[model samples]
Target: HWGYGKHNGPEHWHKDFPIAKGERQSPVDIDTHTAKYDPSLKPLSVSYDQATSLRILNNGHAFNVEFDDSQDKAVLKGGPLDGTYRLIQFHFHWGSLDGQGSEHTVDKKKYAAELHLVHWNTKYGDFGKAVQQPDGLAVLGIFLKVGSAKPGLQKVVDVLDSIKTKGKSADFTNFDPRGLLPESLDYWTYPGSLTTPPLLECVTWIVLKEPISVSSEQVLKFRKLNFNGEGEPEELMVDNWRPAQPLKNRQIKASFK
Candidate 1:
């Protein structure tokens, strides 16, 4: 299995998953100076309900807060999308230290963290089925700047102590992800693949230009997560992000000028 270790990390992923080198690979640095603005884009609409959140699971790869997507209960629509995309799960990436984590950089500058809200097109029926299609996913990449601690994220931070080990999960209900968003909806959009391996090129990437705030202390907790189970030599789960890839033939479109 591919991992973040030197012998099996991102650099070696292409050996197993050839698509890792696909033209539409993700985590591209959003160069605002070069991005073309398009007034044609509509305002982004996110309707995430707290009641729809099921639980938070430590999937070994990262901590993900999965949702009930059986229906169009918690959906993200409008901007950069043709139809409603149901929220399937949300996860994050961070580093062992400050200013060294985020997957997608801005103007070649890195941030403390990055949050990924993965949703699937309603037309795909479900995430499993949609992932194979060209337009299966719509992922919102919200950068996390290390500033004041976001009170909205404390609840998620509180549960980390309990689910510190890999594969562990806890009941995390009644949490609305809407509160975690920044005030502005401005973002850049392009076609890209999943940052993780299996690296399917089926996502319409929407990267928020405005980053949400979180505390340096809160980000440190993410670094404390384990990459192994109970009896294994614990590996700290930090730098769990794919390096920025070549932009190739795709052009990143901005929602505002």
Candidate 2:
């Protein structure tokens, strides 16, 4: 399986998942100066009820809080998207040090961490099928910086102990993801792929310009996670972010000046 280890890391992924070298790969550097402002883009809309949250699982690559995406209970719309997309799951990527961890950067500036709210296009049926189409996914990327603790994030942090190992999961419900968002929805939109392997070129990347704050201590708890499953040689889970890819012929659009 692919991992962030030197042998199977991002540099070697293209050998197995050839699309890793594709034209539309993700986590591109958001060059603000070059990004064109598109006044035509509408304000993004996000709706979620606490009940839509299901369970939190440590899937090795990252700990994801999976939601009940069977219906359009929690959805994202407007902005650059054409149809309502169902919220599937959300996860975070971080590094060993606070200096760098975010998958996408601005002017080559990296943040402490990055959060991905993964959603699927309802018109394409479900995540499985939707992932194959060009407009299959719409991912909302939020940057995280070290400062004060965000109360919304503490709920997820408190449960880390229970799911410290890969494949471990615990019941996590009644949590509204909206609280995790920054005040402004202004974002940069571009066509990109999944940052991880099997890097399918099927995502509309909407990266928020503002970053949410979390205490330096809280981010430390995230590193307590084990990349190796229980009973295996334990390894710390950090720096699970992919480096920025070439922009090629793609154009990045901004929703604000």
Candidate 3:
């Protein structure tokens, strides 16, 4: 099994998944100075229904809040997207400490954590078919900074104790994902791949410029989650994020000047 350890981390993923070395890989460092501003880019449209939320799970890699993607109940539209993309799940990446958690950095600045709202384009078909296409997925990336606790995030942090070990999951409903977003939808977008294994180059990444708040205490709760399951050796799930990959001449367009 792959993990965020010295032996099985990002450096070693290319051994099994050669695509990890492919072009258009994810979590690239956003050089704000180099990002081009495109006035043509539209503001992001995010409509999330509270009822679409289903459950939260500790998947060993990271805990994810799953949603009912059977329809366009919770969907993302406009912005760089051509059509509607259904929200499937949202997950996070963080460090053991406050300074080194985020996957993507800005002007070489690393945040406390990063949130990924995964959506699948409805044009091709379902998520399965979409994962293989160039524009199959749309990931909304939000950076998390350590500050006062965000009320909406506190609700998610409240569930950490119930899912302390890998594979543990509990019912999570009536959650509106929109509460997690920052005031501005301004973003930097580019074509990239999944930061995880198999590393498919099918994602259209829209990373928000503004960051949300997550208190130091709230982050401590997340660190308590064990990467190991019931029988495996205990390991704290810290530093689950992948480092920024090479941009390789990809165009990063910003909606804001």
Residue-wise lDDT of candidate 1 within 1-257, one digit each (tens)?
78787688899999999999989998898898999998998889888763388899988879999898998888889898999899989999887777778889898998888999999999979788898988899999999988899998999998998888788999988888987899998989999999998899999999999999998788888888898876889899888888799999999999998
TM-score of every candidate: 0.97, 0.98, 0.98
Ranking by lDDT: 2, 3, 1
lDDT of 2 by residue, 1-257 (tens): 89998788999999999999999999899999999999999999887763388899999999999999988899999999998999999999998999899999999999999999999999999898999998999999999999999999999999999999999999998878988999999999999999998899999999999999999889999989999899999899999999999999999999999
How do all the candidates rank in terms of TM-score, highest first?
Answer: 2, 3, 1
Tell me, by lDDT, which candidate is best. Answer: 2
Per-residue CA lDDT of model 3 for 1-257, tens digit only, reads 67899799999999999988888999999999999999999989888863388999999999999999888798899999999899999999999989989999999899999999999999977999999999999999999999988888988999999998999999998888888999999999999999888799999999999999989999999899999898888899999999999999698999999
Candidate 2 weakest ten by summed lDDT: 45-54
**Residue runs of model 1 more than 4 Å from their true location after superposition:** none
Worst 10 residues of 1 by lDDT: 45-54
- lDDT pick, better of 2 and 3: 2
- In angstroms, give how far residue 254 of model 1 lies from its true place: 0.5
Query: What's the C-alpha lDDT at position 135 in model 1?
Result: 88
